[PDB]
Amino acid sequence: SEPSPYVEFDRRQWRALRMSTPLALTEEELVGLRGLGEQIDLLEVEEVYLPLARLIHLQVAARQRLFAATAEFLGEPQQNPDRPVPFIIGVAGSVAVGKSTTARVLQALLARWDHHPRVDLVTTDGFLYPNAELQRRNLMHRKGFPESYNRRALMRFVTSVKSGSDYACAPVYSHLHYDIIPGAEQVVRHPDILILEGLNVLQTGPTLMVSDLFDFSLYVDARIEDIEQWYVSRFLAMRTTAFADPESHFHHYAAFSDSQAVVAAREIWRTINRPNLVENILPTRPRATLVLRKDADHSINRLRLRKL
Template identity: 45%
Template sequence: MTDIEKKEQYSPYVSLNRDEWKALNGVLNFSLSNEDIGKLHALNEPLNLEEIQEVYFPLSHLLNIHIDYANKLYEAENKYLNSGRKRSPFIIGIAGSVAAGKSTTARVLQKVLSLLPNKPNVALVTTDGFLYPNRILEERGIMNRKGFPESYNTKRLINFLADVKAGKEDLTVPIYSHLEYDITQGEVQEISNPDIVLVEGINVLQVNLSEKHIGPQVFVSDFFDYSIYVHANEKNLLEWYVSRFRQLQRTAFQSPNSYFHRYASLSEKETLALANNIWDLINKPNLIKNILPTRFRANLILEKGSHHFVKGVKLRKV
């Protein structure tokens, strides 16, 4: 047995390159138009049909296996308890760094999972909606720590997930405006009778243990039936973040309604300096301290290469 084979044998994950991964899907194949693909990717995150077919079709096949067995377990347990309780939605957590492409992964999964044979109702929730409003962040002096664990109303997020698992039929989630950089007052996302709920955010796999906490503690990830981490090395993440920031400076920041409108007239040099500064002061420390350490809590890791496309997959052994 080679050293690589020994390492693989005693790793909690099975590592697959892209060719090995794409060959695993022998069941599911969907029809997607260019218009569909155009609606799925985020700013500065390339996406094409090949990526969907080779990465997300096999992933939807795997998730369908887990969902199917979860349904069978539900039926067996219901029979054991002699209960007529309603089946809970299957919850999938999607984590990863700023600029890693979590939002694209979440939207693509929402689309392909909704095309499964039983046509499930797939809801997508982002944890941005559970950020505290800017006024509260400012009151607490943590406006420059937006995205860090303390900037989220975790209790509200956990209560929402508890309602999902309890089978509550009609749910609402706060809406976050990236243009205004704040929670949109008076607007909510309505979710009704979901079969699958995707929860996407940088913080969803964090446990945030505090020395001050006494007694039992519930974490967001406790409610997940499956979890995915979108991974890329820091060099690529910084490059993608700066590139996106530059594009936003030329587009969204130009709107007078944008929170970042004050940066609209910056020179190219000033824009690059600002983007790198934000990364170094906020995003990098959050990545290193809070986000990256959660990577190996995921059931599956999508490993991205330098061009934003997935180059390999790590799958936790069952």
């Protein structure tokens, strides 16, 4: 036998940990959060996301006590009871694994908490370098990799917010144009909770990084072959959604046949997304507070929690 920092759960065990947590989300609101391909329904929100929201609100008060201790030690004032220390959450995972929806659902739940906390959600792609700058660094084929984001700027952003700033700015990325939007900004004003979602978020290193500022993090996981399947399938579905727009950077993909589309999508997975997942994303899975394991049908039926 051997001791471990983690505790594994199946949905039956984890759903019981919901207790009385109310369900403040309608089936229609879920739709507004549901991403293309995603199978998440209100049942999963009850048996999986509600226990998560509970665990997170238990730790928010606790986390603040810790920051209180340091404040006390330093002989500082105290804390405007209504302008606390932002609880930062990191959501990571591979492209097409569902992390985007997971973060949006988590934000909706936490925000509808009795004390109605101001909960902001920022995706890291707003921190991607503009295509022209990526071109400069010869990184257009490495878009999504750690070095494709302005990690300095990202770290400055999260640091500014958790340090108690009145406001902090983040650039905005346009998936439609496949590039940063000139002049656009997302202003975050001292939220009570900040969710940061991106491929890169849990990465660690020789310098203090955004992951070192997280008070809680989740990794959305799945069999790599399944994620590729979801990616390719989402790619074919996009021919009639995003790619169908004449303004789309990838509008030429709309006319691909099922066959040509699979070939193109598989190649991008093989040369860009798979390498990034295997080399940079997966290695960060061990440090996540909670790992959500999804089955081939996108169903979350297993979880791994870090008690230590």
